[PDB]
Design a binder for this molecule. Structure first.
Ligand SMILES: Nc1ncnc2c1ncn2[C@@H]1O[C@H](CSCC[C@H](N)C(=O)O)[C@@H](O)[C@H]1O
Ligand SMILES: Nc1ncnc2c1ncn2[C@@H]1O[C@H](CSCC[C@H](N)C(=O)O)[C@@H](O)[C@H]1O
Lengths: 260, 260
């Protein structure tokens, strides 16, 4: 069985306001992976909180989610167009908003007309996509707040797009699709389990993949993250896959990848 | 002069709740660096918001700051010891809490007894330090919320420690000290201006430096960030400085650096 003081620490994690919208099985998995590394379960709890913030919490806060909820409601009015204002509330979509036009111009012909699109670790990106005519996507994420907002917005707009819970460390999505998006995802997945990026890429049942990385440059060249991600990606990419194209849009390094 | 629509976009940034505690000169500098790269000043505004979130906002939210305020008040009662609970509210200090004992055991003999310590881009770290007997530090940061909390806590505890506003892209701190801490700082500084890390290290007026990097590992080895930071650091380190020691504590790669 489980130690009682360990369960109290896990309980503090599971009842935390900040984690209320993370998949509980993910919270538990992270904590149990860390629990054998600290003598004090309260130290495992702090370590799990940090881990969970790094992999999902930092992109969107708890009350910015209710704020995003109310903004997207004003967008379906068709007056406000605070659609930009809502998508600005998740760190990964706000990063993409200023280059979104360039991004769709350069990526959408790869996806194909009316493609069935899987958006893996989707955050709020399926709302951005859907606004730009890509309305047949299936998002998935461990952040049930993201999932909920996507489904609500899609049903209100008449999109076929939907989202569902998914922890990519314990599930390789089995859906069929024309394309899958792995945007700003592989580094944080590989941080959670060595080899997991290559295992995911080799097993997805979509012939075209869009894989992207953040270039954490902000006017200076930084420590060279873009080249480091590129080298790593080219080294782990399964031999069954081939890069069709590479380019950088608004501090996002984008790869168009084809199944050979 | 400045374009009026550009100033309206800057004004939206300067009046934003999320930025209310960032140094205004820093907000303006970031926006003016980006303003010549977008045709629409509202796109420069979104880009500046993203930049500013990456360099300072993501570590601590706006209301977690009032929460930290109320927790630290209960700690000076000497009953609650929610000191751990407050320091858990800034991402960089919560990362360090579980290894803090190991961290002080391994770093403090380098600082020296009753050292005068500069804490550059200090976040809430001077409160963590001060609790552990390092009570003569001068923190500095662009986050005036951090600065305010540090000064309030220090005066209530009787510490000599203080903090002040400082933008490390436009100022090389001129203070004299026994040691300076550059913790989880050089990558984000170098992302803002190429060469700025080496210029800062070569000009600080302290004979001992503690320089640290996040190892963004979470159970998997990720893309190899630790080795990448190590290689970069060894390449940019000014020849007037020498690494005395290196070790990793709680996903922080730590260098003890001596002026030769
Ligand atoms: N193990 C995991 N399984 C599923 N999603 C995960 C995950 N680890 C992190 N995530 C999700 O990965 C996302 C990283 S931010 C990238 C979001 C989106 N692809 C975009 O580019 O806009 C977060 O939404 C987080 O919830
Ligand atoms: N140009 C700049 N000048 C001063 N501080 C900066 C800065 N860019 C980012 N920062 C600060 O750098 C910090 C990075 S988080 C690291 C905080 C602290 N050293 C610790 O390890 O706990 C944030 O507090 C942010 O406010």
């Amino acid at each position: 069985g489980m130690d009682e003081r360990a369960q109290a620490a896990l309980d503090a994690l599971l009842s935390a306001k900040n984690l209320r919208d993370v998949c509980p099985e993910t919270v538990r998995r992270v904590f149990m992976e860390l629990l054998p590394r600290y003598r004090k379960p309260k130290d495992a709890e702090k370590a799990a909180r940090t881990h969970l913030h790094q992999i999902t919490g930092a992109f969107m806060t708890a009350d910015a989610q209710k704020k995003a909820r109310a903004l997207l409601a004003r967008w379906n009015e068709g007056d406000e167009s605070a659609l930009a204002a809502a998508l600005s509330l998740h760190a990964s979509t706000r990063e993409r908003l200023p280059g979104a036009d360039e991004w769709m111009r350069r990526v959408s012909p790869f996806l194909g007309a009316d493609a069935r699109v899987l958006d893996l670790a989707c955050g709020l990106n399926p709302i951005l996509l859907g606004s730009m005519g890509v309305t047949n996507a299936l998002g998935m994420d461990i952040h049930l707040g993201c999932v909920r907002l996507v489904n609500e917005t899609a049903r209100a707009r008449g999109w076929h797009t939907r989202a569902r819970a998914c922890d990519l460390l314990s599930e390789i999505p089995a859906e069929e699709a024309d394309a899958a998006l792995l945007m700003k995802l592989l580094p944080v997945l590989e941080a959670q389990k060595t080899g997991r990026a290559a295992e995911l890429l080799a097993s997805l049942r979509a012939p075209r993949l869009v894989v992207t990385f953040p270039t954490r440059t902000l006017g200076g060249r930084g420590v060279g993250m873009e080249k480091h991600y590129a080298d790593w990606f080219e080294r782990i990419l399964p031999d069954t896959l081939s890069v069709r194209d590479r380019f950088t849009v608004s501090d996002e390094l984008v790869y168009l990848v084809e199944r050979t």
